[PDB]
Write a protein that binds this ligand. Sequence first.
Ligand SMILES: *[C@@H]1O[C@H](CO)[C@@H](O)[C@H](O)[C@H]1NC(C)=O
Ligand SMILES: *[C@@H]1O[C@H](CO)[C@@H](O)[C@H](O)[C@H]1NC(C)=O
Ligand SMILES: *[C@@H]1O[C@H](CO)[C@@H](O)[C@H](O)[C@H]1NC(C)=O
Ligand SMILES: *[C@@H]1O[C@H](CO)[C@@H](O)[C@H](O)[C@H]1NC(C)=O
Ligand SMILES: *[C@@H]1O[C@H](CO)[C@@H](O)[C@H](O)[C@H]1NC(C)=O
Ligand SMILES: *[C@@H]1O[C@H](CO)[C@@H](O)[C@H](O)[C@H]1NC(C)=O
Lengths: 317, 317, 317
Amino acid sequence: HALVFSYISFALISDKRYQKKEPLISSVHTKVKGIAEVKAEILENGMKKMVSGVFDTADYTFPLQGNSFFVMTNFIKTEGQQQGLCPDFPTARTICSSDRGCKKGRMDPQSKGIQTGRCVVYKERLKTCEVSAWCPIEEVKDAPRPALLNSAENFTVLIKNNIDFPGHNYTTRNILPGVNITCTFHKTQNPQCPIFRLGDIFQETGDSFSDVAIQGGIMGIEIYWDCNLDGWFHHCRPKYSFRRLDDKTTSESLYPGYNFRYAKYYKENNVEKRTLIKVFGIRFDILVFGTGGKFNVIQLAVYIGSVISYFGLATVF
Amino acid sequence: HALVFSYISFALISDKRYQKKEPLISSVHTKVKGIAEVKAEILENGMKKMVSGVFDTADYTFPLQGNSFFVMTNFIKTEGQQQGLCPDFPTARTICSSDRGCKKGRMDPQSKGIQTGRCVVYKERLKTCEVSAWCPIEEVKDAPRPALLNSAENFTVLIKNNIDFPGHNYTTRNILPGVNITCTFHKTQNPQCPIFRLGDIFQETGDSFSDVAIQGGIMGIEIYWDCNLDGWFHHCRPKYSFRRLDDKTTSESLYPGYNFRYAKYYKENNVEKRTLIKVFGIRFDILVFGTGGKFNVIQLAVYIGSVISYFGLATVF
Amino acid sequence: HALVFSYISFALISDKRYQKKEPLISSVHTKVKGIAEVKAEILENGMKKMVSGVFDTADYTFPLQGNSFFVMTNFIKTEGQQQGLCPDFPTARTICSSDRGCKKGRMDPQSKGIQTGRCVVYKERLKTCEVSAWCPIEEVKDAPRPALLNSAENFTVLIKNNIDFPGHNYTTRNILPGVNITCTFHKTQNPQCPIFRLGDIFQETGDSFSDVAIQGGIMGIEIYWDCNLDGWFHHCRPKYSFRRLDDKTTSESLYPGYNFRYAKYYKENNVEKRTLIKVFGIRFDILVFGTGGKFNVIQLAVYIGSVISYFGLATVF
Ligand SMILES: *[C@@H]1O[C@H](CO)[C@@H](O)[C@H](O)[C@H]1NC(C)=O
Ligand SMILES: *[C@@H]1O[C@H](CO)[C@@H](O)[C@H](O)[C@H]1NC(C)=O
Ligand SMILES: *[C@@H]1O[C@H](CO)[C@@H](O)[C@H](O)[C@H]1NC(C)=O
Ligand SMILES: *[C@@H]1O[C@H](CO)[C@@H](O)[C@H](O)[C@H]1NC(C)=O
Ligand SMILES: *[C@@H]1O[C@H](CO)[C@@H](O)[C@H](O)[C@H]1NC(C)=O
Ligand SMILES: *[C@@H]1O[C@H](CO)[C@@H](O)[C@H](O)[C@H]1NC(C)=O
């Protein structure tokens, strides 16, 4: 009988039924470091071109917005586009035998322009449907074989997190004072180091960083706060985990990976022009979840409220 | 008497008091499709101008940041601005009879520059207060009558959501494998289709897409997760709803609609210049709320704790 | 004895144990107003330069993304950078006595380029390690003494918040209809005014706006919703508080303040060039927390469930 009430008291102790718990408030500030040297050969419009250059922080990333940041790992440039008419890029949907194959005004999800209803030669007696759009249309080409910014895994993101508990008067930050900032997070050797190498993140989740860096993906950093605001036992430290939020579908229809089309408008020869940059990379979403706990009498009097009935039926047997 | 305890047991079953519930973690990835052909006539500075051009994804949208994305539906361009002095645009506040009407250094919330304290002619013996700013000052003109990118309603946003339950070992995604991705969400015909036409969203909420697209607004996509992590009955699917978060005030003071001023800096003739683009559109905020539920003994022993007292008083009558 | 049951009933009344509480859904829309006149003298590469110009909304801010916005308060420009080789900027780590001091391919976290392994003169027989990068390398210089956009504190952010309670059928907005929008938030004189002067925010938190505006920081706006969805007593208004989320470390290693490196690519003389803008400012994170409360029988029958045991043991004494 009494051991049953020690099981109730156990449920209280271990389940922290005596504590009030409150959802944590998270603010995030991330600063990434590293530079990537890009020397590769890439064929554009059937002509080989040499891509050489250095990429510093400004060239491959922007500031954190909404608790997530992005790291361009690959890209494709289509310079000199300008408003006009041009034959769409040859694909199963763009290729026409005669003017009747193209319907004027038609626009297909794969096309970047509105059809003109006319069939015209793209190259060497091979005709696609003419469209109106930014010309010439970007190639329906795959990303470079090895990701141009393959060095991305060697980069290091420094994460600084500030968690607040409105219910209590308690606020704290990921980086406690006086810690040795020279470190690299390790599941075991540096569980509280806020410097994270990207390749390490991809290994922890068991995903090859290069593969994802070719077409892009969405990684995810989780920060757990099981904080105890009690004077007796008080613990409040983060728990870093890693999960690949990216879907990994691998189906043209579900737009696999992570990539977006960036536009850089400029004027040349009194003409309105636009360089189009298809950008691939990993987007890192930082997910911070917390629960603050303190001693509460009302919760112990309600838990007592249930335990006194449980006690009456326990004594009835 | 016993029917009272069947009412308690009912409250348990229907209220899921036996389950532990946990807040869901949401990651969002949105890819929008569609292109808008813009041919319209718009008067700038008293002179008619012809706006013709095609707008692809890159021209009217940027990537999702913070679980929300934006779709430019209208705009106004003020090309060639450069640092200098110019007479402010004529309005009830800018118009002066004499140099005494303007105070040097004064800046009014409607003005885009600091007054020079001098009264100067803007056009045809009509004087406004001279200011220092990007010159010439953007017209205090209304947005184009029909939204230039009125085609926006025909666009389709594909939403991909990944929800995780840290408490459990359970993670899932909006798009289950093998589904027919060729679809358009319908309240009844496609409750799980993640392709959403914008016009459909505006109809569901009962707002004309054109009206909002003229001056801009903030729409809102809600995704409900009432997931049951029990082995007996396990359900975990999203519930799409639509709500217009935009205020719809219609008062100059409350800055109605959604619009922002974008700056494009460029150099011409060894001069620093800036094209100013007032941008109008709908911002789409994706709100994902979830609750995961599993069987918990401590909660059933505490609910039992209350139900045994309720039982004692029920028997006392 | 009975006073004990009035203490239980008190815990019910004051703790609102009879109510079901639900987490609030927050949407935020912020429009900032103000313009800053920048006239200052700043030395670049050992030569004095005069920075004069006006800065309107477009020049110093972008739209809210993820419930936070940014206000550039200071900056440093490095115009004309272009891909090439150049001697790194002289610092304790870049300075070399001989070619042996530099290792080819080496890249240090402070460096913005990959070393060429060669020691070259930066200026006046003082040699740094040659690197490949955007040349010339940005100066390792401190921000301007008084923040160029020191006027930032006089700016006014208008915040418009829309909170929804999915559980109930209840939705509301920060700005109730018909209120006098002409106001400035005051802890006591305007607790519901949604116009916030920045300097006021920094004073409330007890931080000098100028100091933070020199190197940058992360401020934080909190909006409390302790809403009561009961018909008897119904209150649903926001509670504005201010907290400095910024860390304030003041250690080179922890990247103190708030600043990022922005890149503006342009072409000159058939050459690829890049103006680099180190941007400093305050990022304002808007934290909205809410709890909606209504009357619930199941919660009053479970609280009664605990209170009937508490009653039995109370009577046992
Ligand atoms: C990344 O760094 C490792 C050393 O940690 C090096 O062996 C490897 O070659 C580097 N890879 C790239 C692409 O820079
Ligand atoms: C930090 O740790 C590294 C070794 O990981 C050591 O070389 C360095 O001296 C330490 N610095 C401080 C300040 O403790
Ligand atoms: C949008 O598409 C519909 C067909 O679904 C068409 O009737 C309508 O004219 C289109 N409107 C615009 C502005 O493209
Ligand atoms: C998907 O559904 C459409 C009809 O809505 C049909 O035409 C198409 O063949 C289907 N595809 C698959 C793979 O089921
Ligand atoms: C800010 O405004 C105050 C008046 O409210 C004025 O006294 C002060 O000089 C202004 N400072 C700047 C930097 O504009
Ligand atoms: C708003 O209050 C100000 C004083 O703070 C007053 O001058 C103005 O007339 C008021 N406007 C309205 C519409 O109440």
